[PDB]
């Protein structure tokens, strides 16, 4: 019960992202997460370039009543395998 959602602008996703994450920019995520992850108990890990937009995303999704949100920071601090542009 986990997913990784890059809430960053999609331009930077095409340069680097975590291996096996989705990109859905923050402003779409607040709708489109309901289509991608209708199970609110799934661990939605949110990340971006640096943490600030994913920090906001964690709060936004907690407000949307997702019961298992996690903030994963930003791509530089995340030390998971990557794919690049």
UniProtKB/Swiss-Prot annotation:
Give the shown range, full length included.
20 to 104 of 104
Question: Keyword Protein transport on this protein?
Answer: no
Induction description: By heat, ethanol, osmotic shock and infection by filamentous bacteriophages. Expression is positively regulated by cyclic AMP-cAMP receptor protein (cAMP-CRP). Expressed at higher levels during growth on glycerol, acetate or proline as carbon source relative to expression during growth on glucose.
Top EC class for this record: transferase
- What's in the misc comment field? Catalysis proceeds by a classical ping-pong bi-bi reaction mechanism, whereby a covalent enzyme-sulfur intermediate is formed on the active site cysteine.
- Give an example GO cellular component term for this record: periplasmic space
Q: Which organism is it from?
A: Escherichia coli (strain K12)
Q: Which GO terms describe its molecular function?
A: thiosulfate-cyanide sulfurtransferase activity
- UniProt main location, coarse: periplasm
Domain Rhodanese, which positions? 1-85
User: Which protein is depicted?
Assistant: Thiosulfate sulfurtransferase PspE
Catalysed reaction(s) here are: thiosulfate + hydrogen cyanide = thiocyanate + sulfite + 2 H(+)
């Amino acid at each position: 019960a986990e997913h990784w959602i890059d809430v960053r602008v999609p331009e930077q996703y095409q340069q680097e992202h975590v291996q096996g994450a989705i990109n859905i920019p923050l402003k779409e995520v607040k709708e489109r997460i309901a289509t991608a992850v209708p199970d609110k108990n799934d661990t939605v890990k949110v990340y971006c370039n640096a943490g600030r937009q994913s920090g906001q995303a964690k709060e936004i999704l907690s407000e949307m009543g997702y019961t298992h949100v996690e903030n994963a920071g930003g791509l530089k601090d995340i030390a998971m395998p990557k794919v690049k542009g």
